[PDB]
Design a protein around this nucleic acid. Sequence first.
RNA 1: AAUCCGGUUAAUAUUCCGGAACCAGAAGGUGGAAUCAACACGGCAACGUAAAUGAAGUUGGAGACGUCGGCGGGAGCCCUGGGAAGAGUUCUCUUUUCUUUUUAACAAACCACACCCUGAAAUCGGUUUAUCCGGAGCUAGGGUAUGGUGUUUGGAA
Lengths: 109, 134, 69, 90, 106, 95
Amino acid sequence: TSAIWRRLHGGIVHATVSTPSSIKSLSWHRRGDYLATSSPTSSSQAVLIHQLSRGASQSPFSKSKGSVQAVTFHPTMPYLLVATQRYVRIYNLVKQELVKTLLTGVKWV
Amino acid sequence: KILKPGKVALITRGRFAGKKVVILQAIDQGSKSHPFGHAVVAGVERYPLKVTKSMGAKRIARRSRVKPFIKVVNYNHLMPTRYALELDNLKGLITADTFKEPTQRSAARKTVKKTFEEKYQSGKSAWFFTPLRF
Amino acid sequence: PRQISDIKQFLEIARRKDATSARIKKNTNKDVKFKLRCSKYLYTLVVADAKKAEKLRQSLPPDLTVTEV
Amino acid sequence: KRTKKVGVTGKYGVRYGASLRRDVRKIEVQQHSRYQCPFCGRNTVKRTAAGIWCCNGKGCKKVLAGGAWTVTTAAATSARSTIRRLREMV
Amino acid sequence: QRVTYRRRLAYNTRSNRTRIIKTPGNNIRYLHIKKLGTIPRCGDTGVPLQGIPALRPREFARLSHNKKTVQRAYGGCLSANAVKDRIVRAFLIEEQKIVKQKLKQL
Amino acid sequence: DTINSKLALTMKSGKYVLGYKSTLKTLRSGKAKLILIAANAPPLRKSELEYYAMLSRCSVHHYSGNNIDLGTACGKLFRVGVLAVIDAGDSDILA
RNA sequence: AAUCCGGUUAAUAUUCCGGAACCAGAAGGUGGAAUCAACACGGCAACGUAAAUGAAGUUGGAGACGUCGGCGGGAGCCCUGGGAAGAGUUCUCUUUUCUUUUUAACAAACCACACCCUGAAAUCGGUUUAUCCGGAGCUAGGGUAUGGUGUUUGGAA
């Protein structure tokens, strides 16, 4: 003070974020500026990155392969860990590309 | 209204093509996750083998085992069929919550497996348990 | 030839008995290439960091034959 | 309209005689004209070889046994009518 | 720079296929290449099959089973629409013969 | 000719769908009452539609003309292989 | 079925030398995968995944195919703007004239006419150089497949 922002027994609500799909996983960046929200149902916009300082939401992925199960932030670097159904993909966000892909050998992560 | 919970149908698209399924519950209105007229079905992935007067109870039971599957299928990919299969054990056990919950998906699959065991052993829906030759 | 992007993979393949020799190649851009001659493939690891370079070089097993540029 | 009389047989120039080019003109127009498919209704039937008429319509792809230059001949149509008459009286 | 055939076969034929390369020694050279592979055709409609590469016949033997097949009935033999027509036609004609059996048994 | 007239009145008064997939939806939902199938329709498609109709207790009429004639009888400038009549309105084609 | 580059002799090289691969066959071994719900899961689907038993029999595909015409893509070549090394020219003129500026097989990752999904189209639209296409589902939207003589890296400086 993509996804739209909107600004009760002590209901001190600050900023409601509405997304097209039911979000399944939530993750926080170390600096508290980025929120990662993932939904497995959607595809094109399965995961959304929300910048609180800019008060905006965006989809950092042009084309997503596989349904996204969960997401988290790297604890030493801005890399985003995307746990899809079968793979785990490492994405570098500052340069917007794919670093590594982990072959879990798992039918469902 | 030819697709109702308890109607036998055929799948023509996907991995389980040519398999006979029973409509567990119809979502003709559609859903946010499936924006079409889909319906959850339970089918027979591996049909039981034919049995004879001979062979011991061990071999007959070994050949009578059935492997089921559960799947959300589009109406356009389902082929409706006049035969109907109903049992109270398979009413309302499946839902969207079951598909999201994988342990419930496996539990429902095992329940469908068992239910097909008593049904096959009792000799009901012999056509449904007979594989279709195409 | 095969490219290895993981240092511990390079050590593991070096530990494997099929490893025969190793080459350290120092390029003009201060990037080192650790190459490992196996029975079937020349496994190459491109280390752009100096400090990771020599800790890896001392990490290599003493029995393995390591050779200068 | 570029040619007045020869039409498709303008590719033959001045050769082979006017009458022979005339007879070829009737047959070549029949041989190359597109025909309505009796199975899919599309105007997609074309001649692959003399007597073979194949439809390029998507999903139909039917191949036909027919006349050399036209899909159906008068003799075939006349006898199909008689054969239908004979089977009905039998 | 002009090039020569690397083999003793003159006469560019369907098996004497060549390609121009620049070698690390700054030489223009031919590389002799094989004929292109073929995606398997469908058994009913004859169209190429979807999900399978274009290899030479002996070259298919080096792929794993899933790379040469599609996880469906007749996968790697028939197209999806061909399989669907097989399924519907089988079921409908079986229904027809059941009805005719009912009609003629009485 | 009378069937053509009833069809023409139906498309001005009642409700309909023109085409294979719209036909299947109406048969599936059970809202379809009568089913027009062109003479030149694929034999597999006709039998599948007839099976659909007898599941959903809908009447079937095998239009004598081909899909071009059926489209012309519909008054539209494309050939139509199959249509479904949900309501005839002023027309009495259902009976 | 499957081999590339550089080097080497007085005379041999895809054959020798150095380096780097590849094919077929064979045996068991190691690691992983399936299996007491015997012979794996996911995707509405096209189909995907590192695996994922299949005898006799039958069937299908590939191998495997004319000729001509333009169109589009790639590679090499040609051409070209700067930089850098030498060399030619220089009464005069010419920030120039010329030469050298290279990257193989192989290995990995990456990459959109057919097909699928929703949706139902006439005030008919889409569209090629070339008029074909659509209620047998156009346009549009989102997907799947095909995938190097392409890009990025290893080879490899």
